[PDB]
Structures are given as C-alpha cells and as structure tokens.
Design a binder for this molecule. Sequence first.
Ligand code: DTP
Ligand SMILES: OC[C@H]1O[C@@](CO)(O[C@H]2O[C@H](CO)[C@@H](O)[C@H](O)[C@H]2O)[C@@H](O)[C@@H]1O
Ligand code: MG
Ligand code: MG
Lengths: 556, 411
Amino acid sequence: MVPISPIETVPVKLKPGMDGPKVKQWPLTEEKIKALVEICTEMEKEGKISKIGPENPYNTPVFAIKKKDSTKWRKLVDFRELNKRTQDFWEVQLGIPHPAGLKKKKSVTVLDVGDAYFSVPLDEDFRKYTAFTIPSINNETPGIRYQYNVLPQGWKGSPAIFQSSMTKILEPFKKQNPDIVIYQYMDDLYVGSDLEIGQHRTKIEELRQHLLRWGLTTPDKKHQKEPPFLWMGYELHPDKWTVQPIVLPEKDSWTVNDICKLVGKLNWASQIYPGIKVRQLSKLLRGTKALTEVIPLTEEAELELAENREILKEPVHGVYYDPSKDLIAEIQKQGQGQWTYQIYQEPFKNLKTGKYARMRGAHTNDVKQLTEAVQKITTESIVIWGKTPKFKLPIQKETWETWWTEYWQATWIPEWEFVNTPPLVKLWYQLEKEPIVGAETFYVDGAANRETKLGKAGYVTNKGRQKVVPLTNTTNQKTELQAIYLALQDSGLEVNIVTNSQYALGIIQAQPDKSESELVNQIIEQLIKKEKVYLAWVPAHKGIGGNEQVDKLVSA
Amino acid sequence: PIETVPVKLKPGMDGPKVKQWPLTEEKIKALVEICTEMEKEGKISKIGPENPYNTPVFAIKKKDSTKWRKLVDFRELNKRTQDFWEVQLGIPHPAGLKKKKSVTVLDVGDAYFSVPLDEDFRKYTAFTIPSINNETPGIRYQYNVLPQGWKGSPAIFQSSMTKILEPFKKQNPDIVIYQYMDDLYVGSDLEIGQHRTKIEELRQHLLRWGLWMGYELHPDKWTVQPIVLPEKDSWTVNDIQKLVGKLNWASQIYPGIKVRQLSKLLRGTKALTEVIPLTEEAELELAENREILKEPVHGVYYDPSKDLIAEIQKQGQGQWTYQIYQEPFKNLKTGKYARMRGAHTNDVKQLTEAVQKITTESIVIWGKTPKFKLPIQKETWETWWTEYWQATWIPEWEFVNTPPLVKLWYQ
DNA sequence: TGGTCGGCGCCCGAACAGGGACTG
DNA sequence: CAGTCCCTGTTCGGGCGCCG
Ligand SMILES: Nc1ncnc2c1ncn2[C@H]1C[C@H](O)[C@@H](COP(=O)(O)OP(=O)(O)OP(=O)(O)O)O1
Ligand SMILES: OC[C@H]1O[C@@](CO)(O[C@H]2O[C@H](CO)[C@@H](O)[C@H](O)[C@H]2O)[C@@H](O)[C@@H]1O
Ligand SMILES: [Mg+2]
Ligand SMILES: [Mg+2]
C-alpha cells in the first residue's frame, strides 16, 4: 500500500482497442528545466507523482509556463495524443456566471483552492498512461520517468472530473447551510451570506475545514476577506461591479492579429460599456490570408475606433439583481444592422449591456433584425436570471401588428411597450392586397442564356407601353428582378405588376429594406417612392394574357 | 427483483449526445424537486462525467393541470433504439379507434417506474440539470427504471400492461384501448356519462396494480378541409389569373383539372381590374372543376413502412391549414384550425397548439407521429416552444420558409 | 524559444443542403 | 423524365476575447 487514497475517483477507460501514448519529449531549454525539476521532485513526496520502471512503455511531451502575476510556475502536459485516444466525457460546465446575476449580499468571501487539479486522484488503472520522461541540463543524465497519481493539467478529462468531484464535496455543506450562496466555478469559490461579518467568517473557516477533510487547501494568499473582490475578471463592490480595466493596443500600424485582439477586447467591454461598435473594425478582417499581414484602417473603422475608445474613457458600472423588481430590456437601432441594448430594473442603473450586430440573410429588414435581437436577449436573460425581461422597443405598436399579422411565418415578441426614442423601426413600403383600379398594369418577364450569360428584361402593358433591354453577364433570376425594376422605373406612383418569377416575388413580399444585391436595393428604392404597388404571380407558359406576350419578347 | 429485458442500440449507432438548453427558474425549481424525490425513490441516481451521453430535460404543465410534469426529450435516443420498439416488441394499431364517438387519453407513464431497466442501457438515459446563472455545474443523473418518454418503456411494459388490462377488456369487449408511449387511448361508442364512468373503472383497475386523466377527443367530429374555388357574380382579370394559378397547381393533385376555357378569358394584354364576363364553356369548365375537387385523389392509401409528413401554413386571422402525407401530392388528410389558444396575439403559441393537435390525430388515425415542416424561423421556435408545450411526446420537425404565391389551401 | 485542457462569447469563410428553372 | 446552375441558408471549425 505505497500510495494512500483520499477521495472517490472516476473510472476512465481508453477508447476501445487503443493503447497509451508514446512520443518523445521536447528539446526543452535548460532555463525552463531548472523550474520543472524542483517542482516535479517535490510531487513524489506528497504522493502526487510516482516513479516507474521501464515496464511502463509510454512517453508524452511536457512543458511549463509561468502563472500570470506570480513567480510560481505552471506544470502542463501536452496530452494531445492521449486525449485523442481517451474516452469522451460530457462536460458539466454549461456556461459562465455573470455578476449581474448575483444578488446583493452583506458579506462576500472569495476563496481559491490550491493545486486543485493535483488534489484530485486519477483513476487507478488509468494512471499508467500518464508516463513522461524528465529532462536534464545535459543530454548525458537520463532523467526519471513519472506517472501521475492525481488529475494532471493538459488532459481532456481533468476539468469535468474536477468540477464533478468539487460539486460532490460541496453538496453536504450547502445542505447544512441552505442560506449560504456558493458560486462554484472550477476551483474558485464565491461565498455570500446575509450573516453579519463576524458570523460569516465563522462559516467561511468552517467551510475551509470541510474542504480540508477531503484534502482541498485554501491558502490565505488567495483568500479575499475585503472588497473590492476580484472574481471572474470583475471587480465586486458592495453595491456595484465592473470589468477589470481593459488595455487596448496603441499601434500606429495594424496587422491582422492586431485587429483580432482589439475586436475581442471590445466584445468583452460591451457587456457593461454601452454603445460599443465593432462593425467597421471587423470589416477589415474579411477575406484575408495571413494573420501576420499588415492592413491599413479605413476612415470608417478609424472613426468607429475613435468613439469606441472614448466610450471606454469614462468609468461605468453595473448593479446587482433584485428579484423583487421587474427586469427591463431596452433596445436601440444603431444603424448598419447594429443594435445595442440595456438590461436594468431601476431606470439608468444598468445590470448589463450588449449588442446584436449579426447580418442574417441576403435580404432583410429592421423588423426581422429587431425580432432577432429580442430573441438573443431573451435567451441570455434566462441563462443569467431565469426569466424574460419586459421589453422597451423603438417600434410603434401598429407597425409590429402590421408586420406579424401579415407575414407568412410565425413570429412573436414577448410582453413589450413602445419607447419613442428615434430612430424608430418601421416598414418602408406596403404591397397592396388587391389590384389598383386605374393604375397601369405591367406584365414583366426576363430570360437569360445559361451558356452565353446573355439575356433580356422587358415589359408589356395594357396601355400599350413596351420595353425590352439587352443584358450581359446575367442569370434568369437576375433578369426577372430586372424586369420588375424596369416596370417600377417606367411607371407612375401607382402600378400593378404581374410576374411569373417565384424567386422575385418571394424576396419582395417580405418587405426588405436592405439587401446584399445592389439590384434589390434599387428595387427597394423605387418601392419606397411609390404610393401603391400590387404584385401578382401567374404560372409561366400557360397562355395567360400579357405574360405570354412579354415571355416571347424576352425569350428572343 | 424483476428480470430486466436487455436492450441494444441500432447497429453502428452510438448513444445520444445533445446539449441541455437553458431553463427558466420555475422549471429548474420544479425539476430539482422532482429529481430529489425520484432519487429518494430510486428511480434515478447521480452520475459522473465519465458517462458521455446526454439528453435534454425540461418540465411542462398539461392542459389545466397546474402541476409540473418532468419531460425528457428522448427523440435522439428513440431514433437510435428504433428497431427495438418497431421490429420486435411493438404494438399493433386498432384501425377502429378513430371511429369511436369518444376517446379519452390517460397518462400511465408512472407505471413504467415499477419495472427496472437493463443495467447496460442506463448509461444512455443520462440527463443534466442546469443552474441559474451557472452557479453550480450541471447535476447529471441516469435512469434506474423505465423512463417516461422513451419508446422502450411501453414495449417492455406491454406484457405487464395487457394482464392489467385483460379483466377490463373482457368485461367490455367493444371498448378499444391503444397505447402510445406514456399515454393510453380509450375509445368507446357509449354516451358521454357512461364513457366517463368506464374510465373511472379502468382507473381503479390501474390503481390496484399500483394518475387521473381528463383529456377527451371525439375523432368522429374530425373533418377535412377541401380545396375550394370562389363564387363570384363578376370576375376581374386578376380574379381569373388567381383562379388559373390555383387550378394549375391543384392539377398536380387532381389530374382531371382543365384550365383551357378559363385561360381563353385572358387572351389579351388587359388591366387587372377589368371585369370579364364568363362564357358558357368557362362556366361549365369551372363547374366540372368544383365537382372534381369534392372527389378523392385516386390511389391515396396509407403505407405503414413510410414516414408521415405534416405541413402547416399560416393563413392569418388565427387560421392555420395542414396537410398530412407520405408522398408529395398524395395527402392522407388535410385540415384547418381556427380560434386556437393565443389566436390574434401569439403565433408561436398557436403553431405549438397546432403541432400538438395534428400529432394527436396522427396517433389516433395511424399510431404514428409525423415529421413537421414548420413555417417559422429556427431561432423563433426554439426560444419559445417549450413555454407552450403541454404534451408528453415530442414529434420531429424541420423549418421551412415558403412565401405563398397562391392560397391553394385557404380561400 | 514555438508548444496543453475545458467552458462561454464574436466574426469569418468554406463546405454542404436543398429547392426552382431550365436544358437534353 | 436526370442533371446542371442559381441562390439561399445552415453548419462547423478556424482565429480572437474572457474564465479556471
Ligand atoms: N493554462 C491552463 N492550462 C490548463 N489548465 C489550467 C490552466 N489554468 C488553470 N487551469 C486549471 C488547472 C488548475 O488546477 C485549475 C485552477 O487553476 P489555478 O487556480 O489558477 O491554479 P492552481 O489551483 O493550480 O494553483 P494555485 O491555486 O495555488 O494558484 O484550473
Ligand atoms: O430544433 C432543432 C434542434 O433540436 C435538437 C435538440 O433539441 O434536436 C432535436 O430535434 C431534432 C429535430 O426534430 C431531432 O432530429 C433531434 O433528434 C432532436 O434531438 C438539436 O439537435 C437541434 O439543434
Ligand atoms: Mg487555485
Ligand atoms: Mg419567360
């Protein structure tokens, strides 16, 4: 019985018919070797690591990196080949806690487990596969071979096993202390109570004893008795919280890798700082080859970046969650398919902010995008607070009623009220339900040759108006749109248009206000200028009326 | 200490791996309470991350119930067990159930908890319970008994179920009983009061074997929605153009449709609002057409091998149309739903109600659930559908976006 | 030096699905 | 009656940000 057992372990099979890793170690520089050898020798005395005779035919690389903001070093095993052959787990970490979720607490303690991975036993049968060979200052000295006795860093089963093991240990304490809040994220524990500060510390130490029984050690160095606490990248104060300060690179010449860091920082910032916009900065990253390549900033991404930095200039903060009061989400349209929102309970005291910029579809309008932002906010709220906020939306109640009742898809927004903050969201044009009396009727069609890419778009009308236009480098779809554009160009303020194009009718009936296609944008531009448009569809090649005549013209 | 029937997945198929979606605080609270009792009673037990299989879980309230019901989305598992509950231990379908004047549906799901489950299979019933704001990691469980909503549960329990049923069945030979997953469909031709009473008898009969159900269907009332052509004193060019397009599309279903004489009416290049008198030939062609649409399609018959497909269209003003079929244009049923819950205020609640009603009819008529083509955006449906779901099963669906060129189904 | 693991978020582009219209 | 080509929309894996 050379090694003792501390806490219940987790059976871990290999993927069937596969065997443990063998691969030679890295040419590690001696400077790193000094740090590694000292820590690794220490492990055996605890019982975390064990020596192995060459009976263990497994080799896996090893390396190390310094713990940030510390002199200590982190011991990390490149188990990429062992992961590949290790059984799959089901991750139990379903997301990240947000401070806006937290309720106000009288006393808050943040404590960190020490050597958390190294305090959890690895599976006994599985221990053999860990094996790695240590290196020396020269290549003369061989170095000892070691197998882990506990969870190691760089494996693919370590986080889930630790989180599940940690939860099992915590569960008895939380059952004895129903009124303590413990946010458990990896080894970081957030403990909050309404107990008075002296009584709270009694529970905190008592919890430390409970964790001690299972070999989990909470050092004083990471203990956080006094606010403001540092937790999950946030600064926690008794009544407010904020993100830990974010440094944005100042570079005069920007590479591709540069913009990525910038963008990713601004997304982290946008959870509290209102109105962050990344649209034009991300425009610089589309269709680029080298991560190293240098790229100049347009005057759009530059102007954007300027006001983005200025938003960060002033400190902002969020508040905590009061289950007694309602949740409220307000959304503003920011232009170019950009939307920002604020979630709050008391006016002007925000829980959090955010943005929805995703461009979805080749053709869309503001009402669809507003509906998308509402859904993203609703799901986000359910994660953080488990309920849907009341919505304040910059869209008239009648606009929304007109859209959803007439649309052919099921669509819905939860309980909401109108806020009169411009720019308001509206439908730019409305198609008539019935044909317009006394308006000219344009029968439109277009065709194109698959091989030549040549085509014609034209119309015929009841008054005798006619047009045919030749087109180059086109498609059948594009000429059917073109035909409609021609009828709109050449008509008065009220017009009936008859097409046989299902493609075109589907785009236009969804009332788009923006399109990737310039041709659709021009069609939109014309639709907005009309007083009345009636679009109707007939089947092609049925000998119908004007449709037959215009079909002959464009086919030629 | 009961024998456990062994179960296996379809060959070459691994277990379900489906992420748990976010849950509202009320549902999480209900699930934690339900699972605590189920663990105490040994129905489920906690499991580690070494199990690599997960199935989504959430809670529902059945119509008027007010009491939370745990519901597991086993669709992925059921697809990987499929051969088991069809090929081997399955149930035959009583063609007479749709003919009964009244059919009551009972939730016998609790019975399944009695029987235990094959130890080798329990790894596949894993489900994770989420926490608000991710305070805790996910609390994983697995099933030690026959789970509600799995398709092996009614098959494994069918031996036990028939013996419990058999005294009741002999006492009333006429009454018809069908079992689909957690549900028992009880169809009698009796008068209302006698029917309800016999259900109480079958309730007690279930009670002395170790649950109250009040959902009543009347499949004989169920009717269909014929394709209909408008009646007009006068016809404009637009009206005839709409009619020709509708008739031409309809001719993919009824091959006897003819548009020639109606097409003749639109030979020129005419203004849409111009009134067009009908000729005798068109009046007769239109008459013959309306008659044909009353008739059935030739050679439409259900095929047990093939899957059912359901299509739904939003017609506006609280009205919905659906078609059930297996082959394109060979429709086994077509219908309309109006004035459902959420009418004129919530499309998703109405679409949800529609999906449920259509699935119920398919279970009664054919003992299957169709795969739905849903007229909604994937993100809109997934955000809200669980909020309005009141059934213990969950059909398969996909999402479609068809703008409607012509209103064939509605008028 | 360059190098590990899991989670979540964004934005990207490529690879893939599928529905119509037209070509033989 | 297949087989393409358009065109659209989805999915998935890549990079970055953030947390252990
Ligand atoms: N860069 C990383 N690579 C792999 N695993 C990591 C990494 N960073 C953290 N982890 C994992 C392993 C750790 O056991 C666990 C917690 O990390 P952390 O608390 O910061 O240090 P630690 O608990 O190992 O030592 P200590 O608490 O004394 O600082 O999360
Ligand atoms: O809605 C699609 C979405 O649902 C998931 C899980 O909820 O898949 C489920 O629904 C599918 C369509 O009915 C089924 O085929 C599948 O088996 C079932 O798990 C997700 O996989 C998917 O993103
Ligand atoms: Mg630690
Ligand atoms: Mg044509």
